[PDB]
C-alpha cells in the first residue's frame, strides 16, 4: 500500500544519499576501495576530475588529493659555507602536484606528509650541495639569482619524455618556486 511506497521511496533516497559523490573544484579525489583502486585502468589509476560521481556504499571510502600549490617551510637549518662559517637559512618552497596517479603511487600514503618529508630531504640535500661552494657575502647579496633559481631548476630536472628517477618529476610533485626568507648568523658572529 501507500506505506510500502513511502518506505521504498525513502529507502532509495537514503541509498542515493549514501552513494552520492561530490568533488570540489579545488581538489581531485579518487575512490579508496580496500583492494582494487590501486592499478585501476591498467597501469594508471583513475583521476576522477571534479564533478558528480556515483560510488558503491561500503566497498570503498572517500578521500581527496589537493590540486593547488602548497607551501612547506623549513623553520631552521644549519649550512657550512665555503669559508667554513655556519649559516642559518629559513626558506619556504612551493610545490604543485603534477601527475596525481604517480603522486599517489610513489608516496607511501595519500597524506601529504610523506611527500612533504621527501621534498624536504631532497631540497635540503641539494641546498647543502649548492651553498657549500659559495661565500656568505655572495649568499646574502644575490642569492635569488645564483641559488634559488638554480636549486629549483636542478630539483625539477634532477641533474647531479625522459624522467630521471633522481628527479622530483619521477615523483608526482613539481617545484614551482624556491625562495629564501631569512638568513641568520651563529650567536658568536652575531
Amino acid at each position: 500500500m501507500r506505506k510500502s511506497v513511502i518506505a521504498i521511496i525513502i529507502i532509495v533516497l537514503v541509498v542515493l544519499y549514501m552513494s552520492v559523490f561530490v568533488v570540489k573544484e579545488g581538489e581531485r579525489g579518487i575512490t579508496l576501495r580496500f583492494g582494487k583502486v590501486l592499478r585501476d585502468d591498467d597501469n594508471k589509476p583513475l583521476v576522477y576530475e571534479p564533478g558528480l560521481h556515483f560510488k558503491i556504499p561500503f566497498i570503498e571510502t572517500v578521500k581527496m588529493l589537493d590540486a593547488r600549490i602548497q607551501t612547506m617551510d623549513n623553520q631552521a637549518d644549519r649550512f657550512v659555507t665555503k669559508e667554513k662559517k655556519d649559516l642559518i637559512v629559513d626558506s619556504y618552497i612551493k610545490w604543485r602536484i603534477s601527475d596525481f596517479s604517480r603522486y599517489y603511487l610513489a608516496t607511501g600514503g595519500g597524506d601529504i606528509s610523506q611527500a612533504e618529508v621527501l621534498l624536504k630531504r631532497k631540497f635540503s640535500d641539494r641546498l647543502r650541495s649548492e651553498i657549500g661552494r659559495l661565500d656568505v657575502k655572495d649568499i646574502v647579496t644575490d642569492s635569488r639569482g645564483r641559488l634559488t633559481l638554480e636549486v629549483r631548476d636542478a630539483l625539477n630536472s634532477g641533474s647531479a619524455p625522459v624522467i630521471n628517477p633522481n628527479s622530483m618529476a619521477a615523483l608526482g610533485i613539481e617545484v614551482v618556486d624556491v625562495r629564501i626568507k631569512q638568513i641568520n648568523l651563529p650567536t658568536e658572529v652575531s
Binding site: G51, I69, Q70, T71, Y92, V140, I180, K181, Q182
Partner: protein, 161 residues
C-alpha cells in the same frame, strides 16, 4: 490530492531556501557540485539548495599586511626593518583556487623580497636614503615574485615604515 500538496510544499521550501544575500563589498564564486558555475554580483540572489554552493570573497576592501624583521645588509650589518603592503583581490577564482591561503603566501613572498632587496644595500645608505629606492625596489621584487603564483591578488602599494 495529497501528492499535489506535497509537491507544492517541497517546491515552496526549495524556493525559500534558494534565496541568499551577498554583501555589497563582497563578490561570490558559485560552483554547482564543484564545477565553478560562475561569478556572482552582490545583492539578493537565488541558487538550487543542496546542489550548488557559493563562496563569498571580499573584493572591494583593501587588505594590509605588516612585515618586520632583523635583516642582514651588504656591509655585514643587521637592521630592524618594517614594511606595510597594501593589496586587493581581483578575479576571485584565482584567489580561491590557485594557492592555499594566499595571504600567508603573500606574507612569505614579501619577506623574501624584502631580504633580497635589503641584501644589496649597505647600512648607512639604508638609514639615510632608504624610503624612495628601498620602497621602489621592494615593490618591484614583490610583484615579480607574486606573478608566477598567479594569485588573484593585485599589489596596491608598499610603503616604508
Amino acid at each position: 490530492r495529497v501528492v499535489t500538496i506535497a509537491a507544492a510544499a517541497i517546491v515552496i521550501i526549495w524556493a525559500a531556501s534558494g534565496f541568499y544575500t551577498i554583501k555589497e563589498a563582497e563578490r561570490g564564486v558559485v560552483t554547482r557540485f564543484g564545477k565553478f558555475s560562475h561569478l556572482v554580483e552582490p545583492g539578493l540572489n537565488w541558487k538550487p539548495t543542496f546542489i550548488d554552493e557559493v563562496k563569498p570573497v571580499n573584493v572591494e576592501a583593501v587588505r594590509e599586511l605588516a612585515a618586520s624583521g632583523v635583516m642582514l645588509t651588504s656591509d655585514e650589518n643587521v637592521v630592524r626593518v618594517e614594511m606595510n603592503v597594501q593589496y586587493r583581490v581581483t578575479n576571485p577564482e584565482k584567489y580561491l583556487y590557485s594557492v592555499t591561503s594566499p595571504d600567508d603566501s603573500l606574507r612569505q613572498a614579501t619577506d623574501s623580497a624584502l631580504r633580497g632587496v635589503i641584501g644589496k644595500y649597505t647600512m648607512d645608505r639604508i638609514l639615510t636614503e632608504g624610503r624612495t629606492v628601498i620602497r621602489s625596489d621592494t615593490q618591484r621584487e614583490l610583484e615579480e615574485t607574486i606573478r608566477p603564483y598567479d594569485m588573484g591578488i593585485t599589489l596596491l602599494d608598499v610603503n616604508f615604515q
